Every structure is written in C-alpha cells, then in structure tokens.
PDB file of C-alpha atoms in Angstrom:
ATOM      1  CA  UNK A   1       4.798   0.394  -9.814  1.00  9.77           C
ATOM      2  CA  UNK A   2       7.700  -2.098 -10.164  1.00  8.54           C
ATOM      3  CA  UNK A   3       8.469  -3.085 -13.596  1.00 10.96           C
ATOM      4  CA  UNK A   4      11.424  -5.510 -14.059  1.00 10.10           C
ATOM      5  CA  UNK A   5      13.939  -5.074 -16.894  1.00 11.47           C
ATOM      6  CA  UNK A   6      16.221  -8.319 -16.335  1.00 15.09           C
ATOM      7  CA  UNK A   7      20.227  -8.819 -18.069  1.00 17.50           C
ATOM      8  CA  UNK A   8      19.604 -12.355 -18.270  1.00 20.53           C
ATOM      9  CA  UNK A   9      22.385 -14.549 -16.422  1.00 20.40           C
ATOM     10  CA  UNK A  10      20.841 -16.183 -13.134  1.00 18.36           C
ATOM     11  CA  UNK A  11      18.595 -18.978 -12.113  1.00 19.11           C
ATOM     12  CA  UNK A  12      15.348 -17.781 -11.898  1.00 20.49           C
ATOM     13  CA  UNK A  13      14.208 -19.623  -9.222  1.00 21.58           C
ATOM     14  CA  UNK A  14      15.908 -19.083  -5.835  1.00 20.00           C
ATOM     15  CA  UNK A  15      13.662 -16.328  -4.822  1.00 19.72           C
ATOM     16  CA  UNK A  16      13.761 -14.066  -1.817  1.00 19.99           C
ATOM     17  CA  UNK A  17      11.234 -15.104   0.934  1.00 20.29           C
ATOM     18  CA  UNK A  18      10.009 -13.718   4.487  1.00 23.72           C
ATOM     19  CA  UNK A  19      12.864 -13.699   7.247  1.00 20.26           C
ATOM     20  CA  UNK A  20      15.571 -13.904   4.944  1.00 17.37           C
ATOM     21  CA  UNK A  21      18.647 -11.346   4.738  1.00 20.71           C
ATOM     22  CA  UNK A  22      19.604 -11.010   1.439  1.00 19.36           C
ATOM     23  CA  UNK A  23      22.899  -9.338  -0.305  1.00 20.48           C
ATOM     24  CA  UNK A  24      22.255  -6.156  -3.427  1.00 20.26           C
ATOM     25  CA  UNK A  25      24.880  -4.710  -5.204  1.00 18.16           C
ATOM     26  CA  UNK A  26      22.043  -1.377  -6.174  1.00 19.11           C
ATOM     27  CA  UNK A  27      23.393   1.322  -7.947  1.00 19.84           C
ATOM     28  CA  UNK A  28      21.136   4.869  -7.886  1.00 19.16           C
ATOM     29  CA  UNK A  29      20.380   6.971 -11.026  1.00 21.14           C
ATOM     30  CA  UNK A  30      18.531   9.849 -11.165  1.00 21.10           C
ATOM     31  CA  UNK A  31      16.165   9.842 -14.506  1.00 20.85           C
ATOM     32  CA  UNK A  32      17.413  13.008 -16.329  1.00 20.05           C
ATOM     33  CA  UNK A  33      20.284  13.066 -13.911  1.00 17.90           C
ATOM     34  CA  UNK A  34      23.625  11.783 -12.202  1.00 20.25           C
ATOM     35  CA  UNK A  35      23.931   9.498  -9.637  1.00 19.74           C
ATOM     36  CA  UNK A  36      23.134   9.644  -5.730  1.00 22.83           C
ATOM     37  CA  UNK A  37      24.252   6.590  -4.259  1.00 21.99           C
ATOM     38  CA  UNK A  38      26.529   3.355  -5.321  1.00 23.77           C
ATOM     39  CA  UNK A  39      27.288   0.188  -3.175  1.00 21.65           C
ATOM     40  CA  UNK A  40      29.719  -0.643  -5.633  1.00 20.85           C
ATOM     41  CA  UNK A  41      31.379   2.423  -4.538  1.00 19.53           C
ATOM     42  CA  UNK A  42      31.703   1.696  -0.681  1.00 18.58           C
ATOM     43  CA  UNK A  43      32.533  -1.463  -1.148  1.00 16.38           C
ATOM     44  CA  UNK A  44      30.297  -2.844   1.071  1.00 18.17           C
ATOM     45  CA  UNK A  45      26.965  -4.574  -0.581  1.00 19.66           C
ATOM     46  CA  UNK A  46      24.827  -3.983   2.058  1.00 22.50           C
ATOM     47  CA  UNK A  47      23.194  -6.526   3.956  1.00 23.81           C
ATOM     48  CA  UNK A  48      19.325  -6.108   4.661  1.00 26.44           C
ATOM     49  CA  UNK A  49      16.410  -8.368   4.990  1.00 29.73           C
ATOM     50  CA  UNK A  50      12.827  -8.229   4.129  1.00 31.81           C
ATOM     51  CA  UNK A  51       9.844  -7.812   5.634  1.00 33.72           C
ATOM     52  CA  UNK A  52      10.531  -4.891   8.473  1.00 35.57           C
ATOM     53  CA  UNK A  53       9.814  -1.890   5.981  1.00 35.68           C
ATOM     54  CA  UNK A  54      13.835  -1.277   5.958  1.00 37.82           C
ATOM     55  CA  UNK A  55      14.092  -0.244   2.303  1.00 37.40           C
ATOM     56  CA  UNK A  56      11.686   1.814   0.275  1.00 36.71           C
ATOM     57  CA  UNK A  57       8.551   0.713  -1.309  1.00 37.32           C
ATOM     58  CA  UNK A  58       9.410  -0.030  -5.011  1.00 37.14           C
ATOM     59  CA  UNK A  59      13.065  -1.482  -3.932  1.00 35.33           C
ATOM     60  CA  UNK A  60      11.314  -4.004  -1.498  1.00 34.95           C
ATOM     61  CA  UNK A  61       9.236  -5.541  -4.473  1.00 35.15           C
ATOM     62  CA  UNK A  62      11.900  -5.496  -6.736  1.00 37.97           C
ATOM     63  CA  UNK A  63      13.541  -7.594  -4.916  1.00 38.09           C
ATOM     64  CA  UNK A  64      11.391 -10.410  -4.669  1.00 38.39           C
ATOM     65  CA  UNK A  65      10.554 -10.488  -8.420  1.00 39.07           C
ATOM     66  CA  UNK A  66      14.439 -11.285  -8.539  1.00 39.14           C
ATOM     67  CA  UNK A  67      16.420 -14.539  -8.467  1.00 36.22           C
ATOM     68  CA  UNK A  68      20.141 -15.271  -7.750  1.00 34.71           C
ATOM     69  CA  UNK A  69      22.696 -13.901  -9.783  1.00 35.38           C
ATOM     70  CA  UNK A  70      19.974 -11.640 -11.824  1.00 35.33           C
ATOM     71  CA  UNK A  71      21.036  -8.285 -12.918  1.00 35.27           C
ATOM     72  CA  UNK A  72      17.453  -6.214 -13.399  1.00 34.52           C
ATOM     73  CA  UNK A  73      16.383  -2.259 -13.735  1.00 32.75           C
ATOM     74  CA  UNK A  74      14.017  -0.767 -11.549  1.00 35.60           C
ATOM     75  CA  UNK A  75      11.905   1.886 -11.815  1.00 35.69           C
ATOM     76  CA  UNK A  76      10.290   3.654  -9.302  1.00 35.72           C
ATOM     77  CA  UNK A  77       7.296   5.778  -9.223  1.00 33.91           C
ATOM     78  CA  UNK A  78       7.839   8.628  -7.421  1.00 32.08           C
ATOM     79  CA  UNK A  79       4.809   8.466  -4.608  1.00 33.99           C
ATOM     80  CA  UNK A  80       6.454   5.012  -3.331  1.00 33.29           C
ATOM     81  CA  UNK A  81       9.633   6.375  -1.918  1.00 35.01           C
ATOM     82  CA  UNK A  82       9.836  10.377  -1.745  1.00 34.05           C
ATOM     83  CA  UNK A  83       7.870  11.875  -4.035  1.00 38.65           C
ATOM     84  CA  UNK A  84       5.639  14.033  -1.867  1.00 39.18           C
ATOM     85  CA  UNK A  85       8.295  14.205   0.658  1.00 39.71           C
ATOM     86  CA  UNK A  86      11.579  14.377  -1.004  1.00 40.03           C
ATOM     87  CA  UNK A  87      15.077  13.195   0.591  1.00 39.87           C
ATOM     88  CA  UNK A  88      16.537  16.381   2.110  1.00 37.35           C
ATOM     89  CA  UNK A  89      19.196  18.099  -0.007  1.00 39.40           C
ATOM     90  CA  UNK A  90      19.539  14.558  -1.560  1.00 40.66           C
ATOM     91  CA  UNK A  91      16.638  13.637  -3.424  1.00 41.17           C
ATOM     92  CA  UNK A  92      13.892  16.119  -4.932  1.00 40.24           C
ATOM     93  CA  UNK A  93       9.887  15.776  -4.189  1.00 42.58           C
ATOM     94  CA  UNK A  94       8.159  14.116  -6.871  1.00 43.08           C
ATOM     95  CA  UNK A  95      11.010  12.505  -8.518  1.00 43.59           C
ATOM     96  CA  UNK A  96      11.418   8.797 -10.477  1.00 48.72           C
ATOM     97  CA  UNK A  97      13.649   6.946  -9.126  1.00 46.98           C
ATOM     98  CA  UNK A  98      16.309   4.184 -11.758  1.00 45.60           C
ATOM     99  CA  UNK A  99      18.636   1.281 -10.259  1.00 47.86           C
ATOM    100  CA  UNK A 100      20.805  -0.944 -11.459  1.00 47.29           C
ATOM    101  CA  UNK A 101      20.421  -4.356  -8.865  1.00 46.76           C
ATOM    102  CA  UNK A 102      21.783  -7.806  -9.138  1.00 45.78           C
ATOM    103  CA  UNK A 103      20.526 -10.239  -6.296  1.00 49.26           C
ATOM    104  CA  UNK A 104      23.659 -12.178  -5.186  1.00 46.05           C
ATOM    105  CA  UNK A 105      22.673 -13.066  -1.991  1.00 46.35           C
ATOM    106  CA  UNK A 106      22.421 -15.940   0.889  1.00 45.80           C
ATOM    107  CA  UNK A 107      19.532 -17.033   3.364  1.00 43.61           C
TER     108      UNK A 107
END
C-alpha cells in the first residue's frame, strides 16, 4: 500500500509517465528508528526511470501519484520491498518502511 501525505507546493499535473527518467531527492526513515539512507546527503539526487523494476515496489508507485515540485510521505508496507527478505545488515525482515520525496525532475 502507497498512501500519499503531500507538503503542498507543486503543480499537480506534470506527472511521471512510461520511459521517462525522472530526478528524487528521497530521504529513508526507519518507523521507530534512525535513518538508513539520504540523497540529500551524497549530493547526488539520483537519476532513475520507471518502468524496468529499478526501485522497490511502494517507491515506484509513489512516484507516479506525484507531480513536479511536490514534497509527499510514503509509507511502505513491509511485504513490497523486504519484509520477508530483509536488506542484509541494513534493513530488518518485516519492517515499514517512511520517506521523505519531492519529485523535481525532467523527461
């Protein structure tokens, strides 16, 4: 499940679409817990695209239900990114999953 919690400023219509490479500045939060990961940290906001199973599960819709310049909060379940399996010494099995991720992208 993918349930959007949006900070307002944007347009709320230049959606992501099939083909496209698009630009996230995410930021990872454990629920109960510190971070494990920050683009804002490296610098470098990660250019991916959609549609080739890069990301995980409940980041790839998130994404979509996002315009430019939004700022939402995702939440993800734990059985659509590692919760059976668990990231290894990085992420816990059956864990949920919080992100900070404004959409300022091109394509």
């Amino acid at each position: 499940g993918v349930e959007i919690e949006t900070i307002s400023p944007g347009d709320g219509r230049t959606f992501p679409k099939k083909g496209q490479t698009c630009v996230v500045h995410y930021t990872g939060m454990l629920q109960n817990g510190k971070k494990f990961d920050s683009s804002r940290d490296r610098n470098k906001p990660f250019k991916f695209r959609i549609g080739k199973q890069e990301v995980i599960k409940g980041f790839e819709e998130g994404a979509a239900q996002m315009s430019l310049g939004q700022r939402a909060k995702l939440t993800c379940t734990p059985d659509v990114a590692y919760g059976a399996t668990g990231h290894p010494g990085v992420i816990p099995p059956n864990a949920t999953l919080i992100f900070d991720v404004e959409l300022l992208n091109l394509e």
